[PDB]
């Protein structure tokens, strides 16, 4: 099982499965093991990693697909991170 | 030429009871879809198949203008309406089943209103 490290603007290190991080087109273009994000803070980058797990678990799935929840307080920053990351 | 006043009132009483009829359990007015024909622009496929289109609006107009000369002439146009809905929509559709109930409501209501006079 290969893993990659995604580092936020505030220095938090997120270790995620390589296959899950490739959900992002920007990360896919960069990888083709470590990635630093000088503009994405940890509360946003942790939420992005939860989306990667959600995407891999539920795409082409037969179990009920739950809603991906987004709190109103993080919505604007997460939108910009998703826009930048292409996911 | 005008019809006798007793004939025109019997026609209005039967059509009002069939129009106002509601289901015993749900209370839904079964005639609501049948009041007005869909427009020729809305549903031209209806007019391609149905040669003599008719709705409860045309039936009430035909009572007012004395086009029906008896309770049987009125019944013919109510059965035509219901048969048109059955032919267009076919078995298994709720509208097909509603038209079958309305044909039965017309006959029960007609027998009651004729026994009053």
């Amino acid at each position: 099982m290969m893993y990659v490290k995604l580092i936020s603007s505030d220095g938090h290190e997120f270790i995620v499965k390589r296959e899950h991080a490739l959900t992002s087109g920007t990360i896919k273009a960069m990888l083709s093991n470590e990635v630093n994000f000088r503009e994405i803070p940890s509360h946003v980058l942790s939420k992005v990693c939860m989306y990667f797990t959600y995407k891999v678990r539920y795409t082409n799935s037969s179990t009920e697909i739950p809603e991906f929840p987004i709190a109103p307080e993080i919505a604007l920053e997460l939108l910009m991170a998703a826009n930048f990351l292409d996911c | 030429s005008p019809n006798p006043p007793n004939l025109t009132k019997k026609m209005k009483k039967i059509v009002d009871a069939v129009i106002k009829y509601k289901d015993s359990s749900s209370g839904r007015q079964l005639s609501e879809v049948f009041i007005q024909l869909p427009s020729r622009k809305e549903l031209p496929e209806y007019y391609e198949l149905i040669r003599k289109p008719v709705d409860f609006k045309k039936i009430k107009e035909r009572i007012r203008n004395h086009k029906y000369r008896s309770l049987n002439d009125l019944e013919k146009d109510v059965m035509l309406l219901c048969q048109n809905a059955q032919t267009f929509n076919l078995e298994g559709s709720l509208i097909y089943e509603d038209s079958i109930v309305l044909q039965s409501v017309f006959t029960s209501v007609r027998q009651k209103i004729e026994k009053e006079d």
Partner: protein
């Protein structure tokens, strides 16, 4: 039944998954493969309570309802420092700004 976790220590967060029937010891073997620290050098926690090696993740309270892909459960991790363990320490994430007047 799969459970989705965030194994957290200082400023490190491992995103991983395991079965509800898998053990806490098997979860330390996953940490060992990533961070090269043996199981005997790890303490795993849930809500500040030390997890037993023989217990299943389901027995610890990690289920499909509490440990979801989109909302994973946190597992605290402390490593052994020389002969003693360090105190469990998880650095919090940053905070979003105040909600704008238009969103209220």
């Amino acid at each position: 039944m799969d459970v989705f976790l965030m194994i957290r220590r200082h400023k490190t967060t491992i995103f991983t998954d395991a079965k509800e029937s898998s053990t806490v010891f098997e979860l330390k073997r996953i940490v060992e493969g990533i961070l090269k620290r043996p199981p005997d050098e790890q303490r795993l926690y849930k809500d500040d309570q030390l997890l037993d090696d023989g217990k299943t993740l389901g027995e610890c309270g990690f289920t499909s309802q509490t440990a979801r892909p989109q909302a994973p459960a946190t597992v605290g991790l402390a490593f052994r420092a020389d002969d003693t363990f360090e105190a469990l320490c998880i650095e919090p994430f940053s905070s979003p700004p105040e909600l704008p007047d238009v969103m209220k």
